[PDB]
Design a protein around this ligand. Structure first.
Ligand SMILES: C[N+](C)(CCF)CCCC(=O)O
Ligand SMILES: C[N+](C)(CCF)CCCC(=O)O
Ligand SMILES: O=C(O)CNC(=O)C(=O)O
Ligand SMILES: O=C(O)CNC(=O)C(=O)O
Ligand SMILES: NCCCCCCN
Ligand SMILES: NCCCCCCN
Ligand SMILES: [Zn+2]
Ligand SMILES: [Zn+2]
Ligand SMILES: [Zn+2]
Ligand SMILES: [Zn+2]
Lengths: 384, 384
């Protein structure tokens, strides 16, 4: 009834096609869009699922010349004699109504988020299960997307585990710190992460214009002298800030802050970026946080009168993150792997004590959100 | 005279430090910024060139308690008894005046562009020279940034050459099409690039939310039956469009277009993105073009009434790109490598004839602009 065609016709100077379905709903389709998306072998490369049709071949004033239909298909002739057939279900899916468009967007991009504070039930799955089973791997990635974090238990206490997850996702995101990297105390540390010091809430790699979307951290060795993990849901914190201190929100969401990283690791590097700490989309919704206090530059490209209020704003924000209602704290054990959204969460670590031997060792890696969402979409298809 | 201190004092409730230099210029430095950027070993990790100071340790209302200076340094005490020393040249570089801030930004980010049309003198260098010599590699990357394209001659007619340039830059950008990929006609092509068809002007990989910044294409085998390259300077074209058709510019710079890519190559993939074809920064300047007509989705997330004007806009834009005043066309030979800005240029290829043997073969790869700018900054330091 919903995907079955009752009538199809050309309207509005033949610049529109109207489909009345057997459920009584009507859908409208611009003629130029139909022509642009002709699935015939001249216009569309089936092996690539891509358009061969050039913009140059498209008449933007085109009208439908003839049309006939049955219950499952419309058949169209165009003024230049080109001929196009479209399937009902294909058309219905791509319906231009607000409701149909949003439904499809939700399927494509899994936009739903569950905001949290200190009440977090840390989502947990088994590691080998996620490797072995599509049902678990699906639960893993969809929860990662929705919640911002998933902990995997029962991995080895050995290097190479995050690599396995990278292969499971697809591939990891190479940076100047390697394909994977070792978080432990280091002589002549090129990075504050590689010392025993406390790391306050940050996101990783704001020194890059495209920070890692997803972070993986696997505990190989844990100290008893400290080293507790802390996380916070940045989207939740931003929402509170806008409510509590609109002016601090406005400043943090509009001021470009310079980040830097000069050193040698996988390779030699001199990295510089500008980011707004609270990054908004065009509708004003928070879509990324860009903030590591370690790598924030001494260079600060703002007029003198904006400097102190920026700091007063940053301070309110950090104070919100440290609030007992926002942060969740936990201690990783050897065999634990945490995988999280490095665009949304901020994460941190308590100080611990240095020794002559390595008391504490994590292995980490990153992955791009597009690579992760790809595996997510494929995994959903296999399980449903 | 310019970097030598004549006087230093605390002003404005000690919330500001003023430095009068021996050239008579004055510079102003917020107290909170001085404290935030104390270079002492408690506040700053020298091996990492990073801030250890936490936002939590920072009093945003702080004032300078005491100050003394000589010609090369200021020495500051803070109300909590912390103590800070700063160097004159360091301070002067980071001066908050509009002129000083922009000077430093230009050094960091090489913002200058030379716009072009059909008059292009295609910048050309030798390949082995760029590998062997920092002076040439510097000329390579700075010209890439400024002009948007550089052609390297005298490479081999063999796979593996783009890899060498990736190592010279630092590393290449892994995608679903491999670390490097082979552009040639392919049975069951997963991509229109892998056929003999014409490719109209496009940027590569808009299906990703972070498209490759830099593209490398190396000609191993060339056909005489066609295969000419075409390029266009997208920033230049956008500028003309805004002038000629503001409404088309407005539409293309505000409408989110969906891109897609489903297939198997390096790995299996289902990729989806949304981008504005003309992407602007917060000051309205064009910073990226996101447009491949092949991978533009059949899905189009706009209200029915916006569809046809979008197409009329896209059409004006493509027509501008094809104008004999904008495009530059050339034919690559075996041994040629083109390296360009895939955020600014659009590129294309003329059709050629299929055969039983491979008549035409390119090898390509990508790299991130941050990885490229890093090598650029380091190269400038070594040559100057
Ligand atoms: C974990 N680290 C040290 C190496 C992987 F990149 C990065 C720290 C985050 C940062 O430098 O922003
Ligand atoms: C050159 N290609 C086929 C493979 C490297 F990614 C990509 C074409 C550009 C696109 O699919 O957008
Ligand atoms: O060591 C930890 O627990 C946390 N480490 C980091 O957040 C890091 O290295 O960026
Ligand atoms: O084959 C060519 O000359 C150009 N190829 C491409 O632009 C591509 O593969 O994306
Ligand atoms: N069953 C309808 C088939 C229509 C084919 C038309 C060919 N021009
Ligand atoms: N030459 C000036 C040195 C100042 C040192 C001050 C230590 N509190
Ligand atoms: Zn067709
Ligand atoms: Zn971190
Ligand atoms: Zn200090
Ligand atoms: Zn291309």
């Amino acid at each position: 009834m919903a995907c079955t065609i009752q009538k199809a016709e050309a309207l509005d100077g033949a610049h529109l096609m109207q489909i009345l379905w057997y459920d009584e709903e009507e859908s409208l389709y611009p003629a130029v869009w139909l022509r642009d998306n002709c699935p015939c072998s001249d216009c569309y490369l089936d092996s690539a699922k891509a358009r061969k049709l050039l913009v140059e071949a498209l008449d933007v004033n085109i009208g439908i010349k003839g049309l006939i239909f049955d219950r499952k298909k419309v058949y169209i002739t165009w003024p230049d004699e080109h001929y196009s057939e479209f399937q009902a279900d294909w058309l219905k899916k791509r319906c231009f109504s607000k409701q149909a468009r949003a439904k499809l967007q939700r399927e494509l991009f899994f936009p739903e988020c569950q905001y949290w504070g200190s009440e977090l039930q840390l989502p947990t799955l088994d590691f080998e299960d996620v490797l072995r089973y599509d049902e678990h791997a699906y639960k893993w990635l969809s929860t990662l997307k929705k919640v911002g974090i998933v902990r995997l238990t029962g991995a080895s206490d050995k290097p190479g585990e995050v690599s396995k997850l990278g292969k499971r996702m697809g591939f990891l995101y190479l940076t100047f710190y390697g394909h994977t990297w070792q978080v432990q105390d280091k002589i002549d540390a090129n990075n504050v992460a590689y010392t025993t010091g406390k790391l306050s809430f940050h996101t990783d790699y704001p020194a890059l214009h495209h920070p890692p979307g997803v972070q993986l951290l696997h505990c190989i060795k844990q100290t008893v002298t400290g080293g507790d993990s802390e996380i916070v849901d940045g989207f939740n914190v931003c929402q509170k800030l806008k409510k509590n201190n609109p002016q601090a929100f406005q400043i943090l969401s509009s001021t470009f802050v310079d980040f830097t990283d000069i050193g040698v690791d996988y390779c030699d590097f001199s990295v510089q970026s500008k980011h707004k700490i609270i990054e908004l989309d065009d509708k004003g919704q928070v879509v990324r946080i860009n903030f590591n206090n370690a790598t924030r530059d001494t260079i600060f490209d703002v007029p003198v009168e904006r400097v102190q209020p920026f700091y007063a704003a940053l301070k309110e924000f950090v104070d919100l993150m440290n609030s007992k209602e926002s942060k969740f704290t936990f201690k990783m054990n050897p065999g634990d792997v945490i995988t999280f959204d490095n665009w949304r969460l901020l994460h941190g670590r308590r100080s611990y004590e240095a020794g002559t031997e390595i008391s504490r060792h994590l292995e980490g890696a990153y992955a791009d959100w597009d690579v992760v969402m790809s595996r997510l979409r494929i995994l959903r298809q296999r399980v449903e």
